[PDB]
Each structure stands twice: as C-alpha cells, then as structure tokens.
Amino acid sequence: SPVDICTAKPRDIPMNPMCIYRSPEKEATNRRVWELSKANSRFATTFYQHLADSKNDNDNIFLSPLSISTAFAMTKLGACNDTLQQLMEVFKFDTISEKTSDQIHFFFAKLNCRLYRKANKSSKLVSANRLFGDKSLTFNETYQDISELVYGAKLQPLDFKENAEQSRAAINKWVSNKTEGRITDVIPSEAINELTVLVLVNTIYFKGLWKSKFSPENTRKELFYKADGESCSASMMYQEGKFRYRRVAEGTQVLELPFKGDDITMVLILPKPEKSLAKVEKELTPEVLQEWLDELEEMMLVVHMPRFRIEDGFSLKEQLQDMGLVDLFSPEKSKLPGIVAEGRDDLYVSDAFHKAFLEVNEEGSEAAASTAVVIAGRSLNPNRVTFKANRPFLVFIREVPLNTIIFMGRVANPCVK
Ligand SMILES: *[C@@H]1O[C@H](CO)[C@@H](O[C@@H]2O[C@H](CO)[C@@H](O[C@@H]3O[C@H](CO[C@H]4O[C@H](CO)[C@@H](O)[C@H](O)[C@@H]4O[C@@H]4O[C@H](CO)[C@@H](O[C@@H]5O[C@H](CO)[C@H](O)[C@H](O)[C@H]5O)[C@H](O)[C@H]4NC(C)=O)[C@@H](O)[C@H](O[C@H]4O[C@H](CO)[C@@H](O)[C@H](O)[C@@H]4O[C@@H]4O[C@H](CO)[C@@H](O)[C@H](O)[C@@H]4O)[C@@H]3O)[C@H](O)[C@H]2NC(C)=O)[C@H](O)[C@H]1NC(C)=O
Ligand SMILES: *[C@@H]1O[C@H](CO)[C@@H](O[C@@H]2O[C@H](CO)[C@@H](O)[C@H](O)[C@H]2NC(C)=O)[C@H](O)[C@H]1NC(C)=O
Ligand SMILES: *[C@@H]1O[C@H](CO)[C@@H](O)[C@H](O)[C@H]1NC(C)=O
Ligand SMILES: *[C@@H]1O[C@H](CO)[C@@H](O)[C@H](O)[C@H]1NC(C)=O
C-alpha cells in the first residue's frame, strides 16, 4: 500500500502544516496517544460544565466531545499565531509533552485508527470526516492532502456562492448517510450563506449490544413527574446480574454496563435519591471519574433503567469563546492562512454546530453525533428547545483500552414525546 497512517511511524508522513506552535516547556507513540486521550477528556468535562451551566438543570444534555475535538483538530490544520495557540490551549493539546503543533494530528490519526480501524464485533464504532469548500475557490494542496491523510477527509465542492441552501441540505444529507438517519439537521437554517468559504464536518456512529441484555417481558410502564409540570409515561426496563458497581461519596451511585466485547462501556452516575447533579457536575474532572472507576467492584444488583431516546442540538460558539477560543470566531483577528491558495487571511469561523442522538433499549444502545465548523457564514442565535423534566442522571459511553469519552451527557427526561 501507499500508506496506512495507522502502521506508519512519525518520521514517515511529511505532516507539515502552515504554522507550528511550540507548547511552553512545563512506546513513545503509544504514551503520546494516551496523553491525547487525557487532553480530550479534560476538554470533555470542562466543556460539559460550561454547557451544563448555560442550560436548565432539568433539561437533557447529550454530545460527543470526541467529535468536537476531532472537528476542531481538523480546523487547527490551517490555523496560525494566536488562533493556533488558542486552539491548542482550549482543547488541551498543549498538555502533551511534544511541543510541536503538527505532531498532534499524527497521534489523533493513531487514536482514530485504534478506535475505528478494527470494526470489533457487536460494537459498530465508525467515523467519517469531510471538508466542503466553495466550488470556485482554490484550496491549498498541502492542507487538502493532510486533511485527507490524517482525518480521512476529502474535499467535496459545493456552490456556496449561488446555492447556499442547496449546499446546506447536501451537507446535512451527507451527515445523515454517515449516521444511519440519526443526525438529520446538523447545520441549522441560514447558517450557510453566500460568503461561506468552507465547512469542516465530523460524524461518529455507535451501535452496541448489551453484554447482559434486558428482556422486554420485565419492562414496565410507569409515571414520571416533571419538575413542576404534569406526568408522562416512561418505559422502565429491569434486570438482575453481576455488574461493576460502587456507591461513592454522598450516596452517589456509579454503575458500569458493558457492551459485547467489553472494550466499549456505558457508565451511569446517579446522585443520591433527593440530591441534585449540580455538585457532581461542578466537581466533575477526568481524575474524579478515573477514581470512581478504580473503586468499582463486581456485584450482584438489580438495575432499573428506562428504554428511551434523547436528541440534542446546539451552537458551540458561546461556550468555546468563554473557554478561551476568541480569535477563531473574530473576523478581524482570526488567523487561518493554511486553507485557501495564497495563504488567505480573511477567514474566521462564523459558527460551529453539534447534534447528538442517543437511544437505549433492551438489546443495547445506539449513539450518533456530528460537529460542523462553518467558515465565514452567518452567526445566528442558539435556538433553545428547553425540555424540562426531573431527577437527572449522567451517561458516559467510553472506550476502555483507549481511555476515551466518545459520548457524554445528562438524561433528565425518559418519556416518549
Ligand atoms: C449511505 O450511502 C450508501 C450508498 O452510497 C448506502 O450503502 C448501501 O448499503 C447497502 C447495505 O446497507 C449496500 O448493500 C450491500 O452491498 C454490498 C457491496 O457493495 C459493493 O459491491 C462491490 C462488491 O460487493 C463493491 O466493489 C462495490 O463498490 C459496492 O459498494 C461499495 O461498498 C463500500 C463498502 O464495501 C461502500 O461503503 C463504504 O464502506 C467504507 C468501508 O471501508 C466506509 O464505511 C464508507 O464510509 C462507506 O461509504 C461504498 O458505498 C460502495 N462504493 C461504491 C463506489 O459504490 C453487498 O456485498 C451486500 O450484500 C450482502 O448482504 C446481503 C444482506 O444480508 C446478503 O443477503 C448478501 O448475500 C450479501 O452477503 C454476502 O453473501 C455472500 C454470498 O454470495 C457471502 O459469501 C458474503 O460473505 C456475504 O455474506 C449488501 O447488499 C449497498 O451496496 C450500499 N450502496 C452502495 C452504492 O454501495 C448506505 O445505506 C447509506 N446510508 C444511509 C443511512 O442512507
Ligand atoms: C500551502 O501550505 C503549505 C504549507 O502547509 C505551503 O508550503 C510552505 O511554503 C513556505 C514557503 O515560503 C514554507 O513555509 C515551506 O516551504 C512550506 N511548508 C511548510 C511546512 O510550511 C504553501 O506555500 C501553501 N500554498 C499556497 C499556494 O498557499
Ligand atoms: C505569527 O505572526 C507573526 C506576525 O504577526 C508572523 O510574522 C509569523 O510568521 C506568524 N507565525 C509564527 C509561526 O510565528
Ligand atoms: C473484531 O471481531 C470481528 C470478528 O468477526 C471482526 O469484525 C474483526 O475481525 C475483529 N477485529 C479485529 C481487530 O480483528
């Protein structure tokens, strides 16, 4: 073969983007891949807190932080100066020993190969990345080749200048194809206009089978009482088995439900019966979570968990700006000269969107998500569909061997609307 970046060694691919940043001084590939995972999780939890804090406590939250990271790592390929430094610091890519910014993508390809280049039994875990550039412009060749080489991202030309809305529909349909119909409207209406230069897209799809499934015979319907609202119907599944469990500080229950193969698991964090999720969420760090996992012991238990689905869609502009990502979104100060032929400097991100889906039932779980960075479109207002319910719990879908948070969120409403 020409190249499988997966087997390749760091001194093989000539992965040399426009600008490089050196992180201040504060196997080697395998240890760096483990370091990338910690970065992603610190980004995950920190990002989670800002998102949580901007939403109602009784509303659902669901996302793929990995997706986001990937999408903005692709965006980082043509960044420069403070925009390059900001991307590095916000996604915690500057927490790895290797100071070079160009090295990050290499380990991200390693990480991605481990994740999605096995296709391991009863654990469909696939990912697709794509760049959608205006059809009249000329993209830097090095940028295109590296984006394809590292992220598997080809550049599909779309007429943004004359057919913006047709282009948006084309991108949403591409995302729909890669997520099995789960993600249908990543880009919201009017996000893409006539001046849109490029859209960077990531998508992840999961479908797992439970290692120990619930039987539909034992599933029963029961009334769920919303915050102040009325009641709704929720389908509660039941099962009795041996699960890795632990009740940590303050009556906080941590339960792990493995997927066939044991490489991918779902983790549930339920706050004490009366208490809220605010404390757990406020003190939520990667290290806290790792401590909890380390305290888990196998144990016979009865599991009552709902059969449900939750979708969540939002802009990421607010939260990332608050986290330190300011330059990228400013027309005036954004620096992305590695994308368009002739090192073009007037590009900035107008908005970035995320749409995630989660479905849990008797046979297993299925998740999907998509991130999309729009360069030079219109910046709109986050259309909030605040759906309040009660007594929420945390959900995490992780890859065990690779220390990776794929999906993450809060299920507050288990009813079927
Ligand atoms: C998104 O769009 C896609 C279309 O663009 C949709 O995909 C369509 O999905 C259906 C199934 O869901 C699929 O049917 C299968 O077709 C198989 C193979 O097609 C290939 O045909 C020859 C060889 O067979 C290839 O050379 C040819 O190019 C075909 O198509 C390409 O296939 C690749 C993958 O092989 C495609 O996908 C890419 O895959 C890569 C992975 O590296 C990555 O995930 C990409 O992201 C992904 O895009 C690519 O789209 C295709 N390229 C081109 C240029 O077209 C059949 O082999 C298969 O049939 C088996 O299954 C049935 C069902 O159970 C059995 O009954 C059959 O017998 C058969 O089983 C076999 O039986 C043998 C006995 O003879 C036995 O020995 C053997 O082991 C096996 O058991 C099945 O019919 C469509 O082909 C596919 N469309 C296209 C155009 O390919 C997708 O649904 C869309 N998603 C949404 C949500 O809309
Ligand atoms: C496309 O981007 C590549 C880098 O990703 C540019 O190539 C660089 O060219 C300048 C020459 O002045 C030097 O910095 C290096 O020789 C090249 N590589 C690196 C690592 O920077 C190339 O100029 C860009 N092409 C266009 C037309 O914009
Ligand atoms: C960053 O900006 C300065 C000027 O603002 C420029 O001279 C330099 O080439 C840029 N990139 C790096 C890697 O410093
Ligand atoms: C994972 O298990 C199934 C066995 O049929 C298959 O998809 C694949 O061969 C296995 N993955 C690897 C890494 O071999």
Swiss-Prot record:
Impact upon substituting N172K: In AT3D; type-II; Glasgow-3
Q: Provide this UniProt record's keywords sorted from A to Z.
A: Blood coagulation, Disease variant, Disulfide bond, Glycoprotein, Hemostasis, Heparin-binding, Phosphoprotein, Protease inhibitor, Secreted, Serine protease inhibitor, Signal, Thrombophilia
Q: What are the recorded GO MF terms, alphabetically?
A: heparin binding; identical protein binding; protease binding; serine-type endopeptidase inhibitor activity
Instruction: Note the effect listed for M18T.
Output: Previously Whitechapel
Outcome after substituting A389T: In AT3D; type-II; Oslo/Paris-3
Q: What tissues express this gene product?
A: Found in plasma.
Q: What is the effect of changing E222K?
A: In AT3D; type-II; Truro; increases affinity for heparin
Q: Which GO terms describe its cellular component?
A: blood microparticle; collagen-containing extracellular matrix; endoplasmic reticulum lumen; extracellular exosome; extracellular region; extracellular space; plasma membrane
Q: What is the effect of changing R32H?
A: In AT3D; type-II; Rouen-1/Padua-1/Bligny/Budapest-2; lack of heparin-binding properties
| Consequence recorded when altering R114Q | In AT3D; type-II; Geneva
Q: What is the effect of changing L394P?
A: In AT3D; type-II
Main subcellular location? secreted
Q: What is the effect of changing T196I?
A: In AT3D; type-I
- Cross-referenced InterPro entries: Antithrombin_3_serpin_domain, Serpin_CS, Serpin_dom, Serpin_fam, Serpin_sf, Serpin_sf_1, Serpin_sf_2
Result for mutant: S350P: In AT3D; type-I
Report the sequence similarity comment from the record: Belongs to the serpin family.
Name the PANTHER family for this protein.
ANTITHROMBIN-III, SERINE PROTEASE INHIBITOR, SERPIN
User: What binding partners and quaternary form does the record give?
Assistant: Forms protease inhibiting heterodimer with TMPRSS7.
Name of the protein in its database record: Antithrombin-III
The species is: Homo sapiens (Human)
The opening ranks of the lineage are:
Eukaryota, Metazoa, Chordata, Craniata, Vertebrata
